[PDB]
Amino acid sequence: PADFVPDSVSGMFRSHDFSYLRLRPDHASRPLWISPSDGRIILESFSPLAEQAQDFLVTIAEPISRPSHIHEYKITAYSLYAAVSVGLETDDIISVLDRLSKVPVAESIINFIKGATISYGKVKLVIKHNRYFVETTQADILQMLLNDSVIGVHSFEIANESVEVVKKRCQEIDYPVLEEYDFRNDHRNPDLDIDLKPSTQIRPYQEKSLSKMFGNGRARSGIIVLPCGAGKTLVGITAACTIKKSVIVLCTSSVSVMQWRQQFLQWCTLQPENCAVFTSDNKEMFQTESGLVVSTYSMVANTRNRSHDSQKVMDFLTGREWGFIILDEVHVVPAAMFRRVVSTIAAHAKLGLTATLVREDDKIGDLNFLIGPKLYEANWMELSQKGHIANVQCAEVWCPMTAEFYQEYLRETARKRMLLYIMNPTKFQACQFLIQYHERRGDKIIVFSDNVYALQEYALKMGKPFIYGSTPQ
Amino acid sequence: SLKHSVTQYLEEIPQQVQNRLYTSPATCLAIYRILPPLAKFFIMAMVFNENEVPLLDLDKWVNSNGKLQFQNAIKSMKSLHLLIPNKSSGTLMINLNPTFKISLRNALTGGEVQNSFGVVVEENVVSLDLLDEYSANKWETILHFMVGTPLAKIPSEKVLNLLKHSKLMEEVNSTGEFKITNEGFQFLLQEINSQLWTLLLQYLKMIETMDLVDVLHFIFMLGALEVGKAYKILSETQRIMLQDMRDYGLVFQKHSIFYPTKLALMLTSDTIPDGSLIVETNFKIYSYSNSPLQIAVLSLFVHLKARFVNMVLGQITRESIRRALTNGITADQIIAYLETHAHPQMRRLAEEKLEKKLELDPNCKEPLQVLPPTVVDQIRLWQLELDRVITYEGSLYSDFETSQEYNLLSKYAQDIGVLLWKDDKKKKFFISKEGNSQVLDFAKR
């Protein structure tokens, strides 16, 4: 920004005017606009080179909003920390960013990418016989790690419980750690010979998600985000069947845990003998050399009171050195206590499967040092138009509160006001009309309600079955 | 509306003034072009023959199919008093105005014209570098100040006086500021041709005691002039008028000779896009425009977030829409602006959506909506939010001795359209403040 006259309307843009830079002659082709200050990226999805960037942008920048035509990404430290893992250096990112930008990349953006892209690839955490060694490939790192205030070819031991500290400590210091597994050269752990039966049909995006994980040949630990119903179960199954090692699955429900075993059996050749479901109903464990455990966080993250029947199983889980962990619905692992399982269970590879990667608190970023970076993400509309997921006409009905009910809503306190505006009669009428209308259309309807009293009242009024927390499995 | 607006003004002028308005051929050659095609056809027929032609002869020319057009053509021609109906010998004879006739004959056949089209100094200037720049900037200043965007060089009092005195850009001393109105956004929504005619038409009505014909002898003559050439200097009123016209970016003056500009020729006749924008379901806006005029008008109802040389990106929000509505901008105009400034990508996708809709069921033809319906619905809903509370100023009438009297007074209010509410059980009714005195006076009588 030198010798650049401001415009009479520049006042409306408070230090956001980016006209101080000039446009390149090939603007009509290049699809990207780059914000030199906020790091935002505006992508033209209706111009050539749109597809070549829609995947490159997903790697280095988290997506803010991706509407029909104009996509909006943003570059942050964590997004770069995700891209730095899969064989990417600063030069490649800068080269492509300049090659795809209508405007030249500002120095500020170049500075941001340079800072965070050089950290990757000098510390490795390995596991041996349930003992965790922070192995480094050069001697110089000893004067850094052993002299760190928090910590405590050369390899040294570290407390199992203390992994969650050092891994976060590694982030603050120059070098963050990467959890790579060379399952090809791992012989000590007994193998499990399971493969996808020929009837399987690995969809493209599933292959892309796996490629971002097994690109180099050593399984990377991270998170895969796919829309609801995209087939995340088969993604985990394929990862288990390609690593070919004892695997454990954690899922946040009893119905869902049952779903996983049935899915695992159906899609691959996992013999039923080697599968054990550790839920509140049955707790038997496979005695075969290598097997599979599908359990839940509530049955694995408990600390204080475990029953005698559930104590032997937990010791069975802890004693062996597992080869793969599948954390279904990984948006709940950074909670106060669920994260403990990631440390107690020994594993050389960790995968996270979730359609939504968001939580109200600030603990979402904690996933980086728990299971690793985010490997792949997929659009929702892209899979919708390709027939992989259904199209939905979202609607929001405005049921005006009747005069009689509304008057009480003014006086009542916050906690009871909720029950008051959940049970207004107009909502009953709207739900009854929609249910009848869609039932005539031969549709299967689901009626959600976080409030149980309304759920029961609606169900008993309409004579329909209902499910809530007190229900036996 | 262009020819309609200019024609409509020319109709209200008294006949005594129209006769004087046709003395200069320059004006005649301009008024002739605005009439319907059939009107021009008949006018050209009568101009060269010094006789009187019965109306039935004119009727014979038109075919049965085009009979309707013959009614509008004759009506519009008679309204301007160009065609004089003379009835004699039992026939409704038709003749052309002698002054209009002579003027047209002089214009076409190159007769003495008394410099109606002006003269030439043969000292040309560069059109692209100066004329385009001068009027574009001068026209830019008036529109920028109109939109309310801050600007360094404010226009002179002449146009400022005209702006306020018009419905455009209502102002209040107590407020101390100027803001655009319902007609203001409509004015900014009109093409350059109509955008210029609105100001010139308002100037015509504003002037008082400068003849009305002279101000038209200049505007219509100004169309005859061709851009990029000199014209030496005319009526006394046309001198101050020329300087006044200089403030609207119509004529450029170095300081003896004046030069018309692109807008000068833009007055007579007609003649990716800049301003096209994309609106997403996320209520975002991306405008492919590089012009402070477009950015300013977008700022009326858009919360701008940043800009690049090629495009401008912002977000639609409740605050911006409320800000525009408070100024009198209707949601219908806003959607019109978005639809008529839509990017080709939106149009193509909308066409494909329509094609798929017709592919499954070709029975119904859904309207082609370029931009998503949710944005339109939300904007209209916000307008309803502004319309939630309804209040009238007026009086409540009560304590009636007799039902007859209550019905009599209330029914009278209904008849004159000043009744807002009534209740037979309570013998009460409310009438607007406007109709209070009429109801009181009727009550006494």
């Binding site: 005006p400 009428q429 709207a430 | 619905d377």
Partner: peptide, 10 residues
């Protein structure tokens, strides 16, 4: 788009 129509109810 059902904006101007009367609200739903009994």
């Amino acid at each position: 788009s059902t904006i101007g129509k009367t609200a739903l109810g009994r």
